[PDB]
């Protein structure tokens, strides 16, 4: 179910089958569609579909509706579909879509190391903000701990595989010491740096590009 929610949030019509009738539409025909006299005469083929492959390319309006689709519609409908009416989920998706646009490899790239790092950081921010007003949510505390550990792993991997983007993210979001050793006792035994070797990230720098290997 979580993967289905994320797939629907990221892609346009994955839930629509070939028959163009969802299961909910099968079971509740009246709640799914209504009768409208005005024909879809203005709506022809979308000649602007090339620039909207995924939902992350359209986070300006509600339901990720492209701007071109709102042409023969009133300013009232435009204001109803403006940014202010977007829900909390829509705004969170807008933030993560901005970050994906910044750090994406291709149109359908959602698993880049930088994208994973920023998504983990956003999840940590959301959980911490929730705990700010609800400090008695034990399950949220545990989820926050897990998300922080995952963010640490993603940030270390991103730092080792692509230092430019990691440094840019750190400078932009002011978390300079986000990757710091917890304990001196373990640090002085070199267990904080042994993580890079144990994670298969020991030798990955391209020494010639950044320094002189002679």
């Amino acid at each position: 179910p979580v993967q289905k929610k994320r797939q629907e949030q990221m892609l346009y019509g994955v839930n629509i089958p070939e028959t163009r009738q969802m299961k909910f539409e099968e079971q509740h025909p009246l709640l799914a569609g209504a009768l409208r006299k005005l024909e879809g005469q203005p709506k022809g083929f979308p000649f602007w579909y090339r620039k909207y492959p995924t939902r992350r390319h359209a986070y300006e309006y509600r339901f990720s509706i492209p701007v071109e689709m709102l042409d023969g519609y009133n300013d009232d409908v435009k204001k109803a579909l403006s940014k202010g009416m977007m829900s909390i989920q829509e705004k969170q998706f807008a933030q993560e879509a901005m970050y994906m646009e910044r750090y994406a490899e291709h149109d359908f790239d959602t698993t880049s190391p930088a994208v994973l790092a920023v998504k983990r950081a956003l999840k940590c921010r959301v959980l911490r903000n929730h705990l700010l007003t609800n400090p008695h949510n034990n399950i949220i505390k545990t989820v926050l701990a897990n998300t922080e550990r995952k963010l640490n792993h993603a940030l270390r991997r991103l730092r080792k595989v692509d230092f430019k983007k990691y440094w840019e993210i750190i400078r932009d979001h002011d978390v300079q010491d986000i990757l710091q050793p917890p304990n001196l006792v373990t640090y002085r035994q070199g267990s904080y740096w042994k993580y890079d070797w144990n994670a298969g990230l020991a030798i990955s720098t391209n020494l010639a590009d950044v320094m002189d290997p002679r």
Partner: peptide, 17 residues
């Protein structure tokens, strides 16, 4: 990095590797 990336997994599923 990783055998998945070496074997060129598409990672089509959103936010899941």
């Amino acid at each position: 990095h990783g055998k998945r990336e070496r074997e060129g997994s598409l990672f089509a599923v959103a936010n899941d590797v």
